[PDB]
């Protein structure tokens, strides 16, 4: 900022004016704008050099919003650490960024990238038989590290329980800890002989995502983020196959554990001799020299009370050293107790796979020092164009609340407030009409409802099935399998159990009469349930995602806050004030005033 | 709209004033150019013929297909008194106005013009450096004040008073400030030529006793003058009005000699793009506008966030649209501004969507949409929020001794269009405050 005349309207911009820097002569070619103060990056995807720019920016930046034309990126310390990790240096990053920038990079930005691009590889952590040695080839630097009281060629054994403490501490200190494991060199750990089946073929983006993890030829821990239905299961299977070591899979739910077992079997050469599932249904353990063990977070994470039969298997899990560990649905690892899974199980390489890297609290960033940096990410819109994930036309139906119903809403307390608008008679009519209309088109409809009471009430009235916690595992699986392969049972209701980590290609439409409090994770996960429809490549096909809300209620506030993640990724919500053809429906629930009054009394009697 | 708006103003002029106006050939040439193309054909034929021509022959001149155009042409000519009809011997003859005919003929050929077009001094001035810069600065300053954005320079008192009296850009003393109304935003949307006449027409209406004919002659003459080529300084009323135009930037004076401005030439007639912007489904806005005015106008209904030399980026928020609607701008104008300044990429993408939709089902045709549907819907919904609750001022009438009297009062109020609510069961009805006096008078009688 020198020899620059402030603009007359510069007051409109609160010190964010960047007119002092002059536009480059070749600005018509460069696709990037760099904001000095905020560090934001504006990228034009319709200009030359778009494709490789997007790949480069994603590597060095964490995407914020990616609409059709203008992509908004941001640079953070964690993003820079991930970039330098995958075979990159400050010299290359600076040259590329300056080359692609429509305007010269400010000195403030240059300092930010420079600082965090030099600490890559000073401190290393390795795992011997069952003892963790935080060693390094050089001897002088570690001596400085050891002097610190927080931690407690040089190699020293560190307490297994306190491993997380040092990992965070290394992040706090200038030098962050690196997680690399040369699976080719070490053969002491028994090797599992497995390879992808000849029929199987890796998709382009799946190949690229796995390439980043193995860019240097050695496996490195990290998190791979792909849209729901992208195929993270196959990415994990391929990652396990290439390492050729023992692999342990931790999964959110037992139903998904079965999916991993089947998916693993369908897409690799492994035989049942080397597969064992440590789930509630059965505690079978593999006796082979090495193999795959798939379990769930609750079983491994549990500390106080675990049965002796489960204890023996858990001791078996903790006994042998493992080569690979897949943390499926890694968005719940930062939970209070699930963090112990990483520490208890000793694995050289840990890979996290999730579709929605979102968490209400500030614990999402902790993943960078529990598993590894965010290695790769994919655009939801980009995959939709390629035909890998079915297109969805999201909508947010506005259901007005009737006067009799609304008056009781105001007087009631907050906790009782939820049940008034969830059981809105107008909302009930909207749900019935949408289901009837979309059932005519031969479309499978899944109706999520977090409120169990409302879920059951809607299901009983509509004569349709439902799944939630009380339902046993056998019944839940039977409904899932039946709904997939039976014409009569075209629609099934669900609850919070089915929100995340379930595969069902048949589902194409989707509704939510009720939902949990404002939380972007559940919205994205529920939307992803219908993003893998098998009939996604058919010409002129569009899946549907309906969100029923009550006007003037707190649900409107939550719904707007509950779809922020989808808006950032690219999805757009359309407001449907009027549903055409609803009046002509011969039968509508709670049409008569007496029925509405009876329902109001019934719902009020709940509390 | 100039081809029609200016015509309407001229028609409202009294016939005697119009006859006086036709004295100057320069004004006649301008009035010649504003008439319909068919009117030009007939007028030119009659200029060189000093004889009466029957209306039937003029009808025969036109083909059967273009009968409607002929009807419009004759009506327009009659409205401005250009054609004077005469009925005699059962024949309806039509002749051109002698004052208009003589003046128009003098303009075409070499003849006395009483220096209507002015006199050349052979002192040219570079236009790209001074006249263009002077014109832009004056128009830039006045527009900035209209938009409301702060600016150190203030428009002259005379122009400020005109805007205060003018409907657009309403100013409220109680608020102590000046604000843009619906008309003001419409003026901004209108092109430069429309904007210039918009101010000029208001000035013509405001002026009372500076003769109106003298002002009109100068304005029409100003169009004839070409950029540069100063002309010697013409009535006294013209001189003072010339100074007023100088404050508007239409004319540049070195202190002696006035150089016609580029805006004057634009005043005669008509004649990635700058100002275009991209609107995403995320509600972000990126405008490739380097002009200071474009940023200021966008800031009226957009929450600006940052700016580069090349472009300015912002985002539509509930605060921005709410602020604009409270000022007086309608949601229809907001969408219109966004669509007209759509980036070429948005237009290309919209065309691709239309082509795909037509391919899927060419039976149904829908209009091409440049902006995303969601952004338009949200802006419209935000406007509906302001009108969520409607309040009327009036009085309630009830406690009627007989139902017949209540029915008669309710019927009378509805007839004069002042009844807001009624209920026969309660024998009550609420009327607007405007009609309260009329209803009370009817009740008394």
């Amino acid at each position: 900022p020198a020899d620059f005349v402030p603009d007359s309207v510069s007051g409109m911009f609160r010190s964010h004016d960047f007119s002092y820097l002059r536009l480059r002569p070749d600005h018509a070619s460069r696709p990037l704008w760099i904001s000095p103060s905020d560090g934001r990056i504006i990228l034009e995807s319709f200009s030359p050099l778009a494709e490789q720019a997007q790949d480069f920016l994603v590597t060095i930046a964490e995407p914020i919003s990616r609409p059709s034309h203008i992509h908004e990126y941001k640079i953070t310390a964690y993003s820079l650490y991930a970039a330098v990790s995958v075979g990159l240096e400050t010299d290359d990053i600076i040259s590329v960024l300056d080359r692609l920038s429509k305007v010269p990079v400010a000195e403030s930005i240059i300092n930010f990238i420079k600082g965090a691009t030099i600490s890559y590889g000073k401190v290393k952590l390795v795992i011997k038989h069952n003892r963790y040695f935080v060693e390094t080839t050089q001897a002088d630097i570690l001596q400085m590290l050891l002097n610190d009281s927080v931690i407690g060629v040089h190699s020293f054994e560190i307490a297994n329980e306190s491993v997380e403490v040092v990992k965070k501490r290394c992040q706090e200190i200038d030098y962050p800890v690196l997680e690399e494991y040369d699976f080719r060199n070490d053969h002491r750990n028994p090797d599992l002989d497995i390879d992808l089946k000849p029929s199987t073929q890796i998709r382009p983006y799946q190949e690229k995502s796995l390439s980043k993890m193995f860019g240097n030829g050695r496996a490195r821990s990290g998190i791979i983020v792909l849209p729901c239905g992208a195929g993270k299961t196959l990415v994990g299977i391929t990652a396990a196959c290439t390492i050729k070591k023992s692999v342990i899979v931790l999964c959110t739910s037992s139903v998904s554990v079965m999916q991993w077992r089947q998916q693993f079997l369908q897409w690799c050469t492994l035989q049942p001799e080397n597969c064992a599932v440590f789930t509630s249904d059965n505690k079978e353990m593999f006796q082979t020299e090495s193999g795959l063990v798939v379990s769930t977070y609750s079983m491994v994470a549990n500390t106080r009370n675990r049965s002796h039969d489960s204890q023996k298997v858990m001791d078996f899990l903790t006994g042998r050293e493992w080569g690979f560990i897949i943390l499926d649905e890694v968005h719940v690892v930062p939970a209070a107790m699930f963090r112990r899974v990483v520490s208890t199980i000793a694995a050289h390489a840990k890979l996290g796979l999730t579709a929605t890297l979102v968490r209400e609290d500030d614990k999402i960033g902790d993943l960078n020092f529990l598993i590894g940096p965010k290695l790769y990410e994919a655009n939801w819109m980009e995959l939709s164009q390629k035909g890998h994930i079915a297109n969805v036309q999201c909508a947010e139906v506005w259901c007005p609340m009737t006067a009799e119903f609304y008056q009781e809403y105001l007087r009631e307390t907050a906790r009782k407030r939820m049940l008034l608008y969830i059981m809105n008679p107008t909302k009930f009519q909207a749900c019935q009409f949408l289901i009837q209309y979309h059932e005519r088109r031969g479309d499978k409809i899944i109706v999520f409802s977090d409120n169990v009471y409302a879920l059951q009430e809607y299901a009983l009235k509509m004569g349709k099935p439902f799944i939630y916690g009380s339902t046993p595992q056998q019944e839940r699986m039977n409904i899932l399998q039946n709904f997939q392969y039976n014409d009569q049972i075209n629609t099934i209701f669900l609850s919070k159990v089915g929100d995340t980590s379930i595969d069902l290609p048949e589902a194409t439409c989707l509704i939510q009469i009720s939902s949990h409090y404002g939380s972007r994770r559940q919205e994205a996960q529920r939307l992803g349930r219908i993003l893998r429809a098998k009939r996604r490549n058919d010409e002129g096909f569009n899946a549907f995602f309906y969100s029923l809300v009550s006007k003037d209620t707190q649900e409107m506030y939550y719904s707007t806050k509950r779809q922020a993640f989808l808006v950032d990724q690219g999805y757009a919500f359309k407001v449907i004030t009027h549903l055409h053809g609803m009046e002509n429906i011969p039968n509508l629930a709670y049409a008569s005033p007496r029925e509405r009054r009876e329902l109001l009394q019934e719902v009020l009697l709940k509390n | 709209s100039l081809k029609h708006s200016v015509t309407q103003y001229l028609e409202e002029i009294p016939q005697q004033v119009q006859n006086r106006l036709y004295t100057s050939p320069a004004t006649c040439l301008a009035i010649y150019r504003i008439l319909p193309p068919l009117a030009k054909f007939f007028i030119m034929a009659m200029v060189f013929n000093e004889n009466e021509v029957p209306l039937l022959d003029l009808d025969k001149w036109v083909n059967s297909n273009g009968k409607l155009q002929f009807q419009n042409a004759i009506k327009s000519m009659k409205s401005l008194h250009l054609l004077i009809p005469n009925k005699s011997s059962g024949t309806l003859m039509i002749n051109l106005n002698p004052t208009f005919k003589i003046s128009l003929r003098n303009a075409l050929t070499g003849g006395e013009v009483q220096n209507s077009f002015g006199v050349v001094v052979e002192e040219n001035v570079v236009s790209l450096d001074l006249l263009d810069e002077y014109s832009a600065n004056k128009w830039e300053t006045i527009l900035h004040f209209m938009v409301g954005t702060p600016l150190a320079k203030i428009p002259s008192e005379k122009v400020l008073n005109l805007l205060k009296h003018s409907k657009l850009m309403e100013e409220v003393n109680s608020t102590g400030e000046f604000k843009i109304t619906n008309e003001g935003f419409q003026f901004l949307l209108q092109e430069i030529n429309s904007q210039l006449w918009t101010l000029l027409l208001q000035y013509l209406k405001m002026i009372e006793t500076m003769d109106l004919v003298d002002v009109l002659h100068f304005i029409f003459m100003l169009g004839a003058l070409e950029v540069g080529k100063a002309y010697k300084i013409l009535s006294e009323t013209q001189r003072i009005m010339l100074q007023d135009m100088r404050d508007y930037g239409l004319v540049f004076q070195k202190h002696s000699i006035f150089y016609p401005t580029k805006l004057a030439l634009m005043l005669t007639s008509d004649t990635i793009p700058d100002g275009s912007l991209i609107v995403e489904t995320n509600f972000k806005i990126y405008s490739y506008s380097n002009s200071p005015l474009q940023i200021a106008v966008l800031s009226l209904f957009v929450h600006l966030k940052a700016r580069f030399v090349n472009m300015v980026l912002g985002q539509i928020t509930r605060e921005s649209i709410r602020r604009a609607l409270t000022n007086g701008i309608t949601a229809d104008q907001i969408i219109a501004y966004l669509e007209t300044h759509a980036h070429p990429q948005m237009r290309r993408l919209a065309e691709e969507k239309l082509e795909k939709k037509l391919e899927l089902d060419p039976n149904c045709k829908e209009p091409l949409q440049v902006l995303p549907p969601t952004v338009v819907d949200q802006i419209r919904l935000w406007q509906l929020e302001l009108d969520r609750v409607i309040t009327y001022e009036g009085s309630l009438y009830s406690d009627f001794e007989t139902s017949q009297e209540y029915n008669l009062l309710s019927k009378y109020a509805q007839d004069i269009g002042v009844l807001l609510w009624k209920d026969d069961k309660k024998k009550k009805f609420f009327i607007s405050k405007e009609g309260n006096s009329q209803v009370l008078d009817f009740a008394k009688r």
Binding site: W398, P400, V575, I576, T577, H578, H580, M582 | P373, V376
Partner: peptide
């Protein structure tokens, strides 16, 4: 875009 149509009910 359905905005001005009567609300469902």
């Amino acid at each position: 875009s359905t905005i001005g149509k009567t609300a469902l009910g």
